[PDB]
Design a protein around this ligand. Structure first.
Ligand code: URC
Length: 472
């Protein structure tokens, strides 16, 4: 009977726009704190420290000091014991530390804590820890919004994000940085889930398309904001502080947003719900039917397809979050990538959905997975002679892959008895945030050929899309 009360008090109107913008704005920085593991932990070119060079023909000393490496570059993990002046066998690893290339990045975490050479596996583990934090935070926060309300949890998660992000930029050792990033990720997941729920509840029966489109648009613009901010600040200690500073002001101004009315009814807090409904009525300027709200009215108010959807969600999350955090090795000009993903995401998603919806829902679902799979797979075949083709295909593939997040949510998830769609979207998202755990760990397979990670990241979505055609 709550929709009757909502229609009595409003619907569309003015408040549902102000609240919408005030909740969409943090999504950009939420995206920023997730893809920030791309300009902070960036690996520049590194070499062994030499006593002859860098104080106690420069090319001649470079040749006589470091043995040549395989990839037409000086070796990054070995050094001559003595200057081999025979050059106009016995090699030994560094102890004096490495020297880095300070031309684009002033200081990275790899620069700070020397996560190179033997200690290489640690870098693709920070993102796995972050995704574990997101998964745990999303799992725990589910049974947290039924006892503590829904508006309070949002404010406390904003404060937690701000405090943990600020503190993490002041740690002197790696494990504490990983722990604070874990906390940041959990709080961010809580923020995202609560924002989605609060957007869903307060609006009318038209909640489906508009708000779920606005959330995706917020993520897409958050990508561009990440790119811009990264272009702005270059140091890594000054990047985390600059990114996490706004969240305190967000916690400050989110202290006045009306709490969800539907939840207050189910718990018996009738007086607060009545006051909240009256204030939204005053804001919406529909102070005509609010008289009928006289408390007594509210007192009286008080298996194949699941497998396929789970597989699609797992493939999307796995490949996307295992391939969207390594744009450094995918091309060049890292600031133009990660800032062209959303610009190639929104138009492609509107156009592809518009052109494909008419042909069929299953056709659109399958076509949104095999196409990016081949798009990614064709990247390894083309040579490095042309870089524009080396970069365009991957960008297009990632943009099309991002369209699956919308295609398998709004047009899909109806593959069920059709009672209500919120019983399956959460279960599908369980895999997504569980599969991205098993993501960047694939990049640990850089040894034993470098084409294997890309081959896997291309094969998995292709197989998922091909199997999606086997619904009957
Ligand atoms: O691969 C993803 N996993 C998620 O858990 C998630 N959440 C979100 O908003 N976008 C995505 N993408």
């Amino acid at each position: 009977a709550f929709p009757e009360l909502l229609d009595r008090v409003g619907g569309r109107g003015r408040f549902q726009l102000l609240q919408a913008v005030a909740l969409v704005t943090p999504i950009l920085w939420v995206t920023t704190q997730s893809m920030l593991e791309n300009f902070s932990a960036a690996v520049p070119h590194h070499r062994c420290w030499v006593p002859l060079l860098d104080n106690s023909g420069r090319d001649v000393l470079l040749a006589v000091s470091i043995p040549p490496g395989p990839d037409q570059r000086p070796h990054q993990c070995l050094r001559f014991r003595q200057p081999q002046w025979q050059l106009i066998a016995d090699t030994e690893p560094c102890e004096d530390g490495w020297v880095y290339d300070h031309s684009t990045f002033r200081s990275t975490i790899v620069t700070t804590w020397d996560l190179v050479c033997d200690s290489q596996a640690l870098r693709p583990m920070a993102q796995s820890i972050f995704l574990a934090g997101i998964l745990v935070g999303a799992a725990v926060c589910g049974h947290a919004s039924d006892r503590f309300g829904r508006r309070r949890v949002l404010t406390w998660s904003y404060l937690l994000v701000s405090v943990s992000g600020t503190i993490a930029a002041l740690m002197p050792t790696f494990p504490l940085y990983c722990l604070f990033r874990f906390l940041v990720a959990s709080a961010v997941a809580g923020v995202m889930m609560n924002t989605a729920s609060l957007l869903m509840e307060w609006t009318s029966a038209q909640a489906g398309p508009l708000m779920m489109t606005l959330n995706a648009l917020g993520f897409s613009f958050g990508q561009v904001l990440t790119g811009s901010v990264a272009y702005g600040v270059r140091s890594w200690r000054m990047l985390q502080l600059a990114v996490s500073a706004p969240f305190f002001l967000f916690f400050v101004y989110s202290w006045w947003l009306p709490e969800s009315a539907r939840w207050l009814i189910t718990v018996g807090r009738l007086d607060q719900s009545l006051r909240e409904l009256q204030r939204v009525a005053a804001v919406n300027r529909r102070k005509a039917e609010a008289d009928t709200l006289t408390v007594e009215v509210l007192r009286s108010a008080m298996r194949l397809r699941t497998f396929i959807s789970m597989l699609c969600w797992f493939a999307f999350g796995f490949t996307f979050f295992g391939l969207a955090l390594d744009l450094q090795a995918l091309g060049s000009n890292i600031f133009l990538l990660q800032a062209l993903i959303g610009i190639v995401d929104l138009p492609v998603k509107m156009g592809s959905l518009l052109l494909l919806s008419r042909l069929g829902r299953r056709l659109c679902q399958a076509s949104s997975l095999v196409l990016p799979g081949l798009c990614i797979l064709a990247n390894i075949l083309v040579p490095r002679e042309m870089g524009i083709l080396r970069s365009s295909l991957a960008v297009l593939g990632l943009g099309s892959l991002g369209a699956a997040f919308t295609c398998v949510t709004i047009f899909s998830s109806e593959l069920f008895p059709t009672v209500i769609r919120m019983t399956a979207v959460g279960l599908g998202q369980v895999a997504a945030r569980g599969g991205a755990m098993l993501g960047p760990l694939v990049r640990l397979l850089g040894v034993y050929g470098s084409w294997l990670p890309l081959l896997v990241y291309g094969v998995v979505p292709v197989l998922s899309g091909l199997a999606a055609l086997l619904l009957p």
